[PDB]
């Protein structure tokens with residue numbers, strides 16, 4: 001089902017960044033005549049199958065693979081502003097004094113932009129839950145930002161701090177509910193919990209959840225029922241949505257459809273203000 005692209009049709013331009021299990025290049029792709037794309041260089045067939053199967057406005061567009069020798073390539077649409085975690089951090093309260101001279105309006109993202117970012121990640125999660133698909137690793141580091149604040153889920157691995165994953169098989173324990181940490185029970189309800197944690201990342205401008213703690217201390221705090229504090233930039237109504245995602249019992253957590261509807265209502269009420 002995965003579309004195969006000829007190596008000759010892929011012209012690598014320059015590296016955009018590099019992660020753990022691969023590199024990311026800006027490239028030009030022919031016969032897709034001349035298109036600007038992002039190429040990830042390294043199961044490969046299973047991850048490619050998933051990206052082929054998924055098709056939504058808030059899931060990164062996938063064009064196919066190149067298995068003509070080595071290295072294995074994955075072709076995606078180019079998302080200009082990169083990963084959402086770095087985007088949040090570089091557009092936070094300390095965006096002006098740290099940004100470059102050419103950078104357009106350096107400063108923190110306003111409430112309207114934070115809600116639009118949150119609403120687009122939720123739209124992608126609504127699509128995944130409708131297909132009974134469990135992501136298992138939802139976090140801003142796995143999201144991408146394109147021109148005009150277009151936000152999409154881009155991956156189904158890399159990290160900002162090495163502490164994002166815990167060796168139990170690497171688990172993103174800071175994003176996980178107690179049933180996932182304790183029994184590896186992954187469901188659309190464990191994904192809604194991770195979405196509540198993504199909301200916390202958005203409203204802290206990309207801070208690591210439980211940053212003050214080591215992964216073993218975070219496991220203890222999470223399983224004991226400790227809740228992440230309300231971020232300074234988070235309105236009380238957004239924190240109430242986070243708490244709805246964080247109900248201890250998986251079946252008591254708000255559905256992603258209701259979370260999305262509430263984020264969309266708040267975003268619409270703030271558009272003209």
Ligand SMILES: c1cncc(CNc2ccc3ncnc(Nc4ccc(N5CCOCC5)cc4)c3n2)c1
Nearest residue numbers: 016017018038076077078079082083141142154155
């Ligand atoms: C990340 C999240 N989700 C999916 C991925 C792979 N998939 C895709 C697809 C399309 C892409 N279009 C542009 N950029 C992409 N990724 C990219 C570019 C630069 C960085 N860095 C490295 C660290 O310092 C700052 C710059 C990071 C990631 C990208 N990744 C990657």
Ligand SMILES: [Cl-]
Nearest residue numbers: 239240241243
């Ligand atoms: Cl509340």
